Amino acid sequence: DNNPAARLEELRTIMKKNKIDVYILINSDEHNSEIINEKDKKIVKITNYSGADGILIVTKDKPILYVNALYELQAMNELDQNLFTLRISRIDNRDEIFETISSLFNTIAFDGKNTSVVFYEKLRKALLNAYPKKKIVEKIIYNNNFDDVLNFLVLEKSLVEIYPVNNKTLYIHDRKYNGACAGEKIDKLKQSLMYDIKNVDNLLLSELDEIAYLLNLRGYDYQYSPLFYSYLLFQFDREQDFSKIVFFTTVKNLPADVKNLLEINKVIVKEYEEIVPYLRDVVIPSIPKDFKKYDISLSPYINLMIYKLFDRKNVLLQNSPVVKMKAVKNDVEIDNMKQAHILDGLALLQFFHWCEQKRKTKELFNETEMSLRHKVDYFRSTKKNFIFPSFSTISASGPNAAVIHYECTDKTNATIKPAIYLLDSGGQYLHGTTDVTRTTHFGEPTAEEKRIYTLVLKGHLRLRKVIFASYTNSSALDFIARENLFNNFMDYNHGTGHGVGLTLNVHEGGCSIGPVGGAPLKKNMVLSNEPGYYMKDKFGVRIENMQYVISKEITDTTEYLSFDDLTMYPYEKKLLDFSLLTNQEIKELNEYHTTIRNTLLPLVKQSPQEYGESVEKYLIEITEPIAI
């Protein structure tokens, strides 16, 4: 059964032969990707815990696994707790793991590729004030030679080695989709280095979405984002342009038309694994010895390996200027995002149309969560310029809808019931990235269900149309999405909205709508709006749109902003509690539903082959105006 006690008792020996006392294993990769590929999942092979968020301290005593609160009920069900000590991380306890590992051992090791500098420093600075007497000697271990050694050891290669290789080639993201040339974007980044960042002439881009966005390239190295393993190094020459641009990537996956076009900036192209020896040997020795000058600017979550090549005093950890660059879409991008959402609405329509028909036949109740998940994914795949799903589809019936990130498996699959059904799904298109949730009911809704839905919907409708002065902090917008739940002493354990990339990652930084951290929003930022509520062992609801920031009104004194919709799919009338709904909400519902009918109905009618009249009747039905 791929035994862990076996692999653990095996590991404890390899730690021993290396004189390595305490070993930290974390689920992540060297690009700080939310979703990691298989080659990077080490934790699961040792614990049988396949959950994405987790950290593994491996010691002489009983190993400890930290996981996030959202993954806990899966870790109890997965992780055997006789072999491994289980523990949860919460917003409460966050630093507990730092406290813990401070509480045990004179030799410690880390995967240099799989650890962020953030984790490392917080730990290292936990052990500074833990044991002021002990001296910390940090070392990068190259080619399993430990014979040169508080020892902090950054490991070049993992002690856990492993999976499919991707041979598919990179492709250009055409200007018609992205609205701006790679050259223009690189010229903007150039301007940032002149004006904004004057204390650094060297910048490394480690975030894959930033590199893809800037070069207008996409790739196949990840299942849910069209990204590709890469680094992009910039070296600035003050007296006022780029000295060199070095692109590290998988060269065999580099097509011919892209290489010649990479003679346009005269970009040097290296292989991916050469980033470390190139920085170590070529870059760093070249940098010469009131106002402080830094050797290099790295992203905040840059992997430990790349970081340790420098002297910490000379590294500057901050966002790339690309972060703000991508957070504000240009109009071509917005227009393209609208087309992607239009295509998605058509796909949702087919999916729920099909559900509804099978609901009548009652064949819907021999279906499973997995079956329904493949169907919506299918309907999206028949859409023009569709690449693949933008994340793993959440298809959850009844009680499983209370599990926020719930994943059906061939193993974990449930029969569809005449109950709450939650569908969180999205797609990657040449036109953009989409993320949408709708909650519906296949049975007779209970009073509690309607009420929970409507209280979630009220927060959601409010955030669709909210009018706010331009200075307003986005944490205020997060609050009004929760108000109606607050009034009932109810809350949801996640953020209200995140930024979203154009054909990049479904979760993009640079802006958000959430309770902790927040900033003012700018026009043509794209954000999700997704309040929810979750009742364990019963059901849950989430309602999610994507929308973008528009200018609502400008007076002599003040600029007011609002949002406009990207997502076009209606809400569920069977779940409405009309005792909770003001007429302004009902009109807003009606105005939205009519906009949907105006948009999608003419597209439906002209592909009667693909859609047909049962579909348009269904569309007309779910968009019919509600009575005041």
Partner: peptide, 4 residues
């Protein structure tokens, strides 16, 4: 899904 949720930003968390």
């Amino acid at each position: 899904x949720p930003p968390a």
